[PDB]
Amino acid sequence: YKRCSNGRSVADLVCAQYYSGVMVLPGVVDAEKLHMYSASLIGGMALGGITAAAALPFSYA
Amino acid sequence: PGDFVNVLAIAGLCVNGEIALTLREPGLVLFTHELQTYTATEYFVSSRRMFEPRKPTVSDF
Numbered sequence A: 001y002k003r004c005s006n007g008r009s010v011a012d013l014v015c016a017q018y019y020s021g022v023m024v025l026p027g028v029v030d031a032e033k034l035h036m037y038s039a040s041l042i043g044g045m046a047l048g049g050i051t052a053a054a055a056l057p058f059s060y061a
Numbered sequence B: 001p002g003d004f005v006n007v008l009a010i011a012g013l014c015v016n017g018e019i020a021l022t023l024r025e026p027g028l029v030l031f032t033h034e035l036q037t038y039t040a041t042e043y044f045v046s047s048r049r050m051f052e053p054r055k056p057t058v059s060d061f
Helices: A013-019 A031-043
Strands: B008-010 B013-015 B019-021 B028-032 B044-047
Touching: none
Parallel strands: none
Antiparallel strands: B008 B028, B013 B019, B028 B044
């Protein structure tokens, strides 16, 4: 929204909505956190114990 | 859980190199406290879900 107050470029649809008063807020979780969760779940299959010095061979899980 | 106990798990017993014993139940683990070696002083069975150890029985294998 830093773009939309600086009129040096003509407002596209995302700013025309904002001048009309309606704001889409940042997505509730970013694809960076959603990736860390997915890798937390995949890695959580190789987590055979909290002494996590090397990963458990998946042929044992 | 406030705490975890770290133990070396054994797949089973290869008696005489002839007969292979393993636990009947996938909810139980056969373990020894002696982490740094392939074989150990004494052996126990507990659930994986809570640490409730007992000596192995001929009926578990």
